[PDB]
Design an enzyme around this catalytic site. Structure first.
Site, short mmCIF file in Angstrom:
data_model
loop_
_atom_site.label_atom_id
_atom_site.label_comp_id
_atom_site.label_asym_id
_atom_site.label_seq_id
_atom_site.Cartn_x
_atom_site.Cartn_y
_atom_site.Cartn_z
N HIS A 1 -41.97 33.85 25.48
CA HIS A 1 -42.79 35.03 25.29
C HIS A 1 -44.27 34.60 25.17
CE1 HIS A 1 -39.98 38.25 25.13
NE2 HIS A 1 -39.33 37.81 24.07
N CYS B 1 -45.29 36.85 28.83
CA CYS B 1 -45.94 38.15 29.06
C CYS B 1 -47.47 38.17 28.87
CB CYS B 1 -45.25 39.18 28.17
SG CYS B 1 -43.43 39.15 28.35
#
Ligand SMILES: O=C(O)c1ccccc1Sc1ccccc1S(=O)(=O)N[C@]12C[C@H]3C[C@H](C[C@H](C3)C1)C2
Lengths: 206, 205
Positions: free
Chosen positions: A88, A130
């Site tokens: 992430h 992300c």
């Protein structure tokens, strides 16, 4: 003259870091399909010539450690070094199981003033999350999404690996990553970003 | 298939923005020799095929405007569009005479959801800071630095122009810029950065 030199005993280390599982405290979630992406990547970069190592549910402290230890290794006999991060991410940070580390800090270990043995050779960094020779020369980054969407794999990776499986040994690195951009853009929306500090053309062969 | 399409009436407009002089109230400095670079650039992008136009000492006002006016023009007959900025800089901000405008502001004007006629076409931005198709697809940025050092030209421009002066019409964009990243590093140390969201190979012919 214009290729990066490949007349080396090995192609190089390729560190995959497959963070699927995160502590609750982070608020981040199980990342599904990352396993399919480690396998794709693991296999693709095996075929290319890389000595692949896949790390798993890696903590911020062990992400920072293993890359430092990898930069202190001797690369005198390697043509380049790849590193691949599957976690992430937020503006300028990759996540770990326990928190976030700046991506710039993770890559810094391979700067020329630190990792003398990877001097003048490509330092490749691929990221799915992300969001008198200079030191930062001979670096390259392929982020999955311009400042990242994915159980049947993820788009950037399914595509990166498709393209390496076929033309990986007959196309320059920018020709590839460009083709990975079109693939992600058309269908696989988002657009992947590519930063190059490379000073020569990178072919994984002959 | 994999080359970007060039069979267009024109290659495109090339807006060069040459900020040499900065206002006293602003605190910025003379960037002297940016006129040698702007001219250097004017000729290179002229040989390539660009309708280069040089604006000098622009305001942050004039820049954001001058780029907005440019994005609203019609490009159906253009292959791409180039833009070149020669001012002082800091992180995600370009300087003017009156201050600084964030660069995203300059580029956003040409996003896919704004400039339908430069869609699927290269949007090129070259920058020297002294100190179902996506929206953000097909831009390319070439920064001069990841400081950036410069009369007698500047290293980044000097090299970019030399490389285009010869190989502009027989070398892909990334190959050119890769050579420009080499010359700046070895011959002079700092390194230029290159961001590509291009989805194809960019040849100027
Ligand atoms: O939306 C557009 O203007 C835009 C349009 C097309 C391509 C990219 C962008 S953005 C942009 C524009 C110019 C230069 C760099 C970038 S960037 O790819 O690196 N994106 C950010 C996003 C935020 C604002 C600012 C600084 C930081 C955080 C990074 C630009």
């Amino acid at each position: 003259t214009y290729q990066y030199n490949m007349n080396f005993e090995k192609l190089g280390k390729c560190i995959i870091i497959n963070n699927k599982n995160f502590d609750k405290v982070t608020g981040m979630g199980v990342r599904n399909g990352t396993d399919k992406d480690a396998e794709a990547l693991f296999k693709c970069f095996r075929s290319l010539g890389f000595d692949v190592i896949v790390y798993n549910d890696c903590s911020c402290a062990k992400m920072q450690d293993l890359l430092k230890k990898a930069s202190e290794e001797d690369h005198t006999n390697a043509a380049c070094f790849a590193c691949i991060l599957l976690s992430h991410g937020e503006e300028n940070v990759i996540y770990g199981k326990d928190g976030v580390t700046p991506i710039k800090d993770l890559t810094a270990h391979f700067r020329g003033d630190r990792c003398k043995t990877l001097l003048e050779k490509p330092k490749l960094f691929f990221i799915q999350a992300c969001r008198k020779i200079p030191v930062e020369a001979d670096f390259l980054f392929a982020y999955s999404t311009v400042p990242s969407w994915r159980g049947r794999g993820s788009w950037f990776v399914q595509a990166l690996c498709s393209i390496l499986e076929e033309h990986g040994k007959d196309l320059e690195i920018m020709q590839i990553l460009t083709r990975v951009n079109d693939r992600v853009a058309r269908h696989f929306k988002q657009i992947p970003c590519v930063v190059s500090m490379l000073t020569k053309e990178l072919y994984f062969s002959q």
